[PDB]
Point group: C3
Chain length 259, copies 3
């Protein structure tokens, strides 16, 4: 039974499902290796249009595997383990397709980090979020990096030092997720978001996501120089040329994308 399931539809939409349900999908070394391999392969495939990051069992993800970690009390071990995790997280952010977290239960510590690194997230009303490493004496330093780029400073600091859960409604308000729905509506809500993305041209979405994360962490003038260069290249893409033509000619664009 694989630690990470992988399914693909006829639209280029890939679902990766964390699959250690009894372990609450904890990010063991082997889980991390599977995620790294999957995102590494998907990054080379221009036909991939979106990834849904889902999870088995009651939890979304409990974070690092504490059993496995505690068995290896070595500074070098932890240095490289955390670097490996960071490599998976940056691979999510570098994938040239949007990655959507499907959060149906608890997301704690590196599990909450996963949600914060995904480009988009849809949660159920009963899902709960925490950076709760501190409850075991391990401040959530790496999850805090991702969290403090989705929520305000005081909200992040409070979460980090107390380790307490935040509701899905509150997480949406804070900026950690995009949508909150009933459990029965979760698949429909994910599909609504996927269908909107896949209807757009791949080139535009890929160029745009890459530019988004380059520009967001620089000064506004540098950001605009990159953005303008990018948007000029995007406009010379055939789907932009066709998309603008179709608008002017009051018709649907012939993008050959799933509708």
């Amino acid at each position: 039974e694989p630690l990470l399931l992988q399914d693909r539809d006829e639209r280029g939409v890939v679902t990766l499902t964390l699959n250690r349900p009894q372990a609450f999908n904890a990010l063991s070394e082997a889980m991390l290796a599977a995620l790294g391999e999957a995102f590494g392969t998907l990054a080379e495939d221009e036909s991939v249009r979106a990834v849904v990051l889902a999870a088995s069992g009651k939890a979304f993800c409990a974070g690092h595997d504490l059993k496995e970690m505690r068995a290896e009390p070595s500074r070098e071990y932890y240095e490289k383990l955390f670097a490996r995790c960071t490599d998976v997280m940056l691979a999510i952010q570098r994938l040239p397709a949007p990655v959507i977290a499907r959060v149906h239960g608890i997301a704690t510590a590196a599990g909450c980090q996963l949600v914060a690194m995904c480009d988009l997230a849809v949660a159920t009303r009963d899902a709960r979020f925490a950076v709760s490493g501190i409850n075991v004496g391990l401040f959530c330093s790496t999850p805090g990096v991702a969290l403090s780029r989705n929520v305000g400073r005081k909200a992040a600091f409070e979460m980090l030092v107390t380790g307490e859960f935040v509701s899905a409604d509150d997480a949406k308000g804070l900026g950690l997720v995009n949508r909150v729905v009933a459990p029965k509506a979760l698949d429909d809500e994910i599909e609504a978001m996927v269908s909107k993305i896949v209807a757009k041209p791949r080139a535009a979405v890929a160029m745009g996501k890459a530019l988004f994360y380059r520009q967001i962490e620089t000064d506004i003038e540098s950001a605009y120089a990159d953005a303008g260069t990018t948007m000029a290249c995007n406009m010379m893409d055939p789907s932009a040329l066709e998309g603008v033509s179709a608008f002017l000619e009051k018709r649907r664009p012939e993008w050959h994308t799933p509708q």
Copy 2:
């Protein structure tokens, strides 16, 4: 009829009105040139106290002029066009008076960018905001620069990749506008904001706006060094000396500003 109307009251409040109502005030080359010249002229006039950026017809601004843009495509043409737009946007942010967007209808793509670049914005409840370039196959890279400096990452990414409208009240929640009112109340709401700004000394407002955007882009220690120097300079301005004396003597400050 001029592409851009310009009116000024006796308080030093300038209203610039986008005036291509049937084209939904699209930012053609000529509209951009007109905006560039207006902001250029205003930047040299220390008597200007505030600018209201308004718009004619049913829309606020549809963004770039797609008919014009599409006619003769080349990488160089788009690079230059987008740089010219960026120059207008940065001129708004660098103007030594606050610029308030008056948004009474749709603001899409570079039209949403304009709102995001203005220091302040008041919208009507029926105004809608989108970064909808993606709907014509052109990811909103340049509007995304501005948008991602007003709203959270996940909210910005969702807007950019889907191109969907956000309501005025949703936009206020997110940080893209300051105030949302009924259509009949828009002028009154603008006036309340303008009246508060013009009552304050020009010097303090000018020094303060400039510092605001320098400091927000650097580290907190560097920010404080610049802010302290700026505030010390401001304190030596006659209106600061008088405003503080007035507080201490329990009277109104003699600033000779509109009341």
Copy 3:
């Protein structure tokens, strides 16, 4: 009475109380010197677990002392005064224990800056917040540094150019405070927060706060490099090894907290 009261409980929780109640706790030169001295001494003491920044009288803090400032104006004096304020504000953010603002009344100008510089804040439902220097012709340039790192750009700009008050509930929504409660519930809400912090290992909280503010101001890859090595160091601390073992053995950790 002293300008700044300082009390400490048996848990290493230190309460600093601004104590110029009739002057609305304004940050005179002497007040700033007292704050600087207290944060300097506290930074050297690894037994301190948390600091509550409280205030006497009706107001939290009105900001700089306008009477004192106005007396002998010079550019050089204002630059030095504002740099002394900044040194206190940065001392707060660099202290190896969380600093919680207990806001029971108005916080204006450098007083609102104080709130924004504290790691956490609990306000009463009638506390009000403004960056109101502009009402005396002095744009809140230094308060805006702190405010713009707690609230959105347009919200911050509007506060700065108009000088108007924002309610406690609105401040919470914006990100300027964590919790809003009735005045009678304030002490209980502060204690709820402090007790959560004290329950965690000091080492972890100290290294975590330091990492938090280093990483927040850099790019995501630099942030992760620093966070990874910091977290690896934390995991070798005996309290992390014990905290994890305790979770695994379904028992409370023996942290002597």
